[PDB]
Amino acid sequence: HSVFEDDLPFLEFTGSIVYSYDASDCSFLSEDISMSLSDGDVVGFDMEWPPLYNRGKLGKVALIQLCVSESKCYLFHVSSMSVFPQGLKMLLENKAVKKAGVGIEGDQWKLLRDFDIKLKNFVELTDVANKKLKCTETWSLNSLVKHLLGKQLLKDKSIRCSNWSKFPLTEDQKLYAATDAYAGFIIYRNLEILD
């Protein structure tokens, strides 16, 4: 195999991982995020859900991740919350904060389906890459991480496809989920600086 096929080092977030599984805690956390951002700021977005199917559709969203800086990421374990946090809902529906990710449009649906929350102002990293990189490629979060960072995303299938609704989350689940939203934040940031 070519050099381009070599196994690269794993992208691993090493900043602060804030784990929340209580509604009001999550809403106040959402306000902290809003107090630390200005209109236009972008955050890495992503979510997880259990394996088993539910009445003909993917298991209901159990975790939502938001990476707000290069040193901090939030894990909102909604599957363990009595009600969906109002401050998070408002945060996610606030067009003042952009959410970056890959396959994000699909997250919007399902988000609407599972929680009746309308994700507002989301950016599909694939479109941003093709724009700033002056190309027309079919990106994945992994291929973007490889191309721009020289790393690959953690890939233990048993972790990535684990029971995300199982409480509490394991340190591995927390690292995987956190890093995925982190990639989203770093990829957007780097792509945006280009000109």
Q: Which of 46, 195, 68, 187 lies closest to 128, judged by CA?
A: 187
* Cβ-Cβ contacts under 8 Å for 56 (sequence gap 6 or more): none
Task: Give whichever of 27 and 141 is closer to Mg ion, judged by the CB atom.
Answer: 141
Per CB under 5 A, 180 contacts Mg ion: yes
Nearest distance in Å: CB 52, Mg ion: 17
171 in a known ligand binding site: no
Site for Mg ion in 7-46 (CB under 5 A): 46
Handedness of CA 35, 40, 43, 49 (dihedral sign): positive
Per CB under 5 A, 114 contacts Mg ion: no
Q: Is 177 exposed, middle or buried (0-12, 13-18, 19+ CB in 10 A)?
A: buried
Task: Give whichever of 114 and 180 is closer to Mg ion, judged by the CB atom.
Answer: 180
Q: How far is the C-alpha of 181 from the C-alpha of 47, rounded, in Å?
A: 8
46 in a known ligand binding site: yes
Shortest-Cβ-distance residue relative to Mg ion: 180
**Count of residues touching Mg ion (by CB under 5 A):** 2
Q: Under the rule (CB under 5 A), what is the footprint of Mg ion?
A: 46, 180
Annotated binding site for Mn(2+): 46, 48, 180
